[PDB]
Design an enzyme around this catalytic site. Structure first.
Site, PDB file in Angstrom:
ATOM      1  N   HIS A   1      30.107  -9.965 -19.202  1.00 30.82           N
ATOM      2  CA  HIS A   1      31.427 -10.325 -19.702  1.00 30.82           C
ATOM      3  C   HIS A   1      32.319  -9.112 -19.941  1.00 30.82           C
ATOM      4  CE1 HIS A   1      29.394  -9.787 -23.774  1.00 30.82           C
ATOM      5  NE2 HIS A   1      30.446  -8.991 -23.850  1.00 30.82           N
TER       6      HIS A   1
ATOM      7  N   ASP B   1      24.231 -13.437 -19.039  1.00 26.19           N
ATOM      8  CA  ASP B   1      25.252 -12.459 -19.394  1.00 26.19           C
ATOM      9  C   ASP B   1      24.735 -11.051 -19.136  1.00 26.19           C
ATOM     10  OD1 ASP B   1      27.671 -11.522 -20.269  1.00 26.19           O
ATOM     11  OD2 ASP B   1      27.276 -11.828 -22.403  1.00 26.19           O
TER      12      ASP B   1
ATOM     13  N   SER C   1      29.183  -5.013 -27.391  1.00 25.43           N
ATOM     14  CA  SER C   1      28.820  -5.815 -26.228  1.00 25.43           C
ATOM     15  C   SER C   1      28.467  -4.945 -25.027  1.00 25.43           C
ATOM     16  CB  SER C   1      29.965  -6.762 -25.864  1.00 25.43           C
ATOM     17  OG  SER C   1      29.620  -8.106 -26.156  1.00 25.43           O
TER      18      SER C   1
HETATM   19  O1  LIG Z   1      34.206 -11.269 -28.873  1.00 25.34           O
HETATM   20  C1  LIG Z   1      33.267 -10.602 -28.640  1.00 25.34           C
HETATM   21  C2  LIG Z   1      32.356 -10.733 -29.883  1.00 25.34           C
HETATM   22  C3  LIG Z   1      32.688 -11.540 -31.036  1.00 25.34           C
HETATM   23  C4  LIG Z   1      31.829 -11.643 -32.158  1.00 25.34           C
HETATM   24  C5  LIG Z   1      30.618 -10.943 -32.158  1.00 25.34           C
HETATM   25  C6  LIG Z   1      29.750 -11.029 -33.253  1.00 25.34           C
HETATM   26  C7  LIG Z   1      28.519 -10.311 -33.230  1.00 25.34           C
HETATM   27  C8  LIG Z   1      28.167  -9.502 -32.098  1.00 25.34           C
HETATM   28  C9  LIG Z   1      29.037  -9.414 -30.990  1.00 25.34           C
HETATM   29  C10 LIG Z   1      30.255 -10.118 -30.999  1.00 25.34           C
HETATM   30  C11 LIG Z   1      31.130 -10.038 -29.901  1.00 25.34           C
HETATM   31  C12 LIG Z   1      33.140  -9.709 -27.114  1.00 25.34           C
HETATM   32  C13 LIG Z   1      34.008 -10.373 -25.984  1.00 25.34           C
HETATM   33  C14 LIG Z   1      35.355  -9.995 -25.768  1.00 25.34           C
HETATM   34  C15 LIG Z   1      36.146 -10.584 -24.745  1.00 25.34           C
HETATM   35  C16 LIG Z   1      35.605 -11.590 -23.892  1.00 25.34           C
HETATM   36  C17 LIG Z   1      34.272 -12.016 -24.056  1.00 25.34           C
HETATM   37  C18 LIG Z   1      33.740 -13.014 -23.208  1.00 25.34           C
HETATM   38  C19 LIG Z   1      32.380 -13.452 -23.375  1.00 25.34           C
HETATM   39  C20 LIG Z   1      31.561 -12.875 -24.397  1.00 25.34           C
HETATM   40  C21 LIG Z   1      32.090 -11.862 -25.259  1.00 25.34           C
HETATM   41  C22 LIG Z   1      33.432 -11.417 -25.110  1.00 25.34           C
HETATM   42  P1  LIG Z   1      33.380  -7.845 -26.839  1.00 25.34           P
HETATM   43  O2  LIG Z   1      34.916  -7.389 -27.022  1.00 25.34           O
HETATM   44  O3  LIG Z   1      32.896  -7.416 -25.370  1.00 25.34           O
HETATM   45  O4  LIG Z   1      32.631  -6.980 -27.777  1.00 25.34           O
END
Ligand SMILES: O=C(c1ccc2ccccc2c1)[C@@H](c1cccc2ccccc12)P(=O)(O)O
Length: 223
Positions: free
Chosen positions: A44, A88, A181
């Site tokens: 992602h 993922d 992530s």
């Molecule tokens: O929203 C996210 C998110 C939110 C809450 C969390 C809580 C605990 C651990 C990790 C977490 C990650 C992600 C993210 C951004 C943007 C698009 C995404 C699409 C799919 C999956 C993640 C995505 P990220 O900006 O790539 O880091």
């Protein structure tokens, strides 16, 4: 990294810094060097132009040890579901071969079907947000006790114990978060998981990608 502590500068060479800021939004991402010209990160954290940087600690500063190599090819998993968030995992074939050194060097991957029983003590690293109010320019890290698939099975909706991993102890206000992530969850000096998603509250447990299950693809794609 919530509740974590700053990592010793360059103590984690395999740690890669993703900069999706160009072809798909502008939000940093994690990732680790699995090979000389390959980096593993969540499927992602994709973009149409990713700039990876190896051998770094403080991305907000031009370190001579830093290696700014662009992603020549950002491959996503053939079955990466965006709704259930399954599969993922994504590989990033650098436009060139990293110059392996004390600051930059691949990390050992686990074996196929290599499980990870609960109670294990892993360590996740990344430049992610320490909180929802502040962030960090220097790579931080923290340990996460892998919990039983039971927990995440009564928390998250689409959780597969076969390809996903339930990490993080609720009793502790520490775990991966926004910006982590892609970061690998190393257990026994072996990158076992990849920060996928979790409670937008940052409160664990959290979901991690089970690399040991995507080995065939991993090899087939790199090979
Ligand atoms: O929203 C996210 C998110 C939110 C809450 C969390 C809580 C605990 C651990 C990790 C977490 C990650 C992600 C993210 C951004 C943007 C698009 C995404 C699409 C799919 C999956 C993640 C995505 P990220 O900006 O790539 O880091």
């Amino acid at each position: 990294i919530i509740g974590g502590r700053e990592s010793r500068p360059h103590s984690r060479p395999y740690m890669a810094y993703l900069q999706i800021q160009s072809p798909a939004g502008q939000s940093r991402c994690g990732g680790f060097l699995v090979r000389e010209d390959f980096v593993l990160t969540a499927a992602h954290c994709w973009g149409s132009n990713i700039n990876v940087t190896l051998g770094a600690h403080n991305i907000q500063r031009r370190e001579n040890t830093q290696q700014h190599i662009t992603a020549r090819r950002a491959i996503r998993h053939p079955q990466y579901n965006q709704r259930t968030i399954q599969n993922d995992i994504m590989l990033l074939q650098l436009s060139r071969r990293v110059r392996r050194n004390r600051n930059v060097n691949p990390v050992a991957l686990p074996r196929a079907q290599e499980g990870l029983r609960p109670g294990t003590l892993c360590t996740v690293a990344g430049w992610g947000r320490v909180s929802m109010r502040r962030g960090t320019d220097t790579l931080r890290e923290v340990q996460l006790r892998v919990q039983r698939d039971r927990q995440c099975l009564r928390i998250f909706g689409s959780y597969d114990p076969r390809r996903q991993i339930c990490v993080g102890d609720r009793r502790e206000r520490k775990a991966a978060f926004k910006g982590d992530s892609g970061g690998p969850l190393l257990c026994n000096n072996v990158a076992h998981g990849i920060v996928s998603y979790g409670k937008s509250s940052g409160v664990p447990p959290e979901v991690f990608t089970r690399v040991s299950s995507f080995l065939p693809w991993i090899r087939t794609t790199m090979r």
